[PDB]
Amino acid sequence: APVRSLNCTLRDSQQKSLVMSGPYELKALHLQGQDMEQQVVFSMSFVQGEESNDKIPVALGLKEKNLYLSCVLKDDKPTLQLESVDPKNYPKKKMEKRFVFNKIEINNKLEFESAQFPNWYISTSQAENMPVFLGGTKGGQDITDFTMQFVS
Numbered sequence: 268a269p270v271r272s273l274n275c276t277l278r279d280s281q282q283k284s285l286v287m288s289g290p291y292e293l294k295a296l297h298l299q300g301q302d303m304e305q306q307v308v309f310s311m312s313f314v315q316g317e318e319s320n321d322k323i324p325v326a327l328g329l330k331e332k333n334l335y336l337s338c339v340l341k342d343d344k345p346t347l348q349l350e351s352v353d354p355k356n357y358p359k360k361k362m363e364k365r366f367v368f369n370k371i372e373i374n375n376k377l378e379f380e381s382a383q384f385p386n387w388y389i390s391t392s393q394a395e396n397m398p399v400f401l402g403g404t405k406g407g408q409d410i411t412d413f414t415m416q417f418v419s
């Protein structure tokens with residue numbers, strides 16, 4: 268059948284919102300009131316991959332954009348990028364592994380682990396207006412926990 272998808276927003280565990288601020292640029296900042304319209308709306312697709320009760324493979328596309336978060340090596344490091352795709356072919360159920368995140372639910376928070384790079388996670392900095400990135404631990408000073416808000 269078709270791939271199933273939900274519209275949503277994400278906030279980090281400091282309640283920082285995610286916004287587009289430049290070509291293929293994604294930043295986290297504290298937002299409230301009118302400025303909240305700036306936040307990115309995702310289409311979260313439920314994709315093929317290894318799955319358990321609390322670990323669900325997803326892709327994260329920008330709503331009605333042919334842009335997906337993906338994990339690739341850049342200058343020999345696992346990195347997070349926005350990647351353009353052919354809009355005729357996406358989303359699909361069998362997303363390529365660079366696009367797949369394991370959405371993990373622990374203690375009412377979500378983590379998004381790269382399926383391609385085990386124990387690398389979508390991460391934000393504690394500082395305001397810094398890039399969203401792929402970080403090589405769910406430990407330390409950077410933030411690896413999120414909440415989802417469902418969008419109409």
Ligand SMILES: N[C@@H]1CCCN(C(=O)CCC(F)(F)F)C1
Binds near residue numbers: 292348
């Ligand atoms: N100043 C930085 C240079 C590296 C890439 N940057 C991103 O914002 C990537 C965001 C995400 F989510 F795609 F990873 C900007």
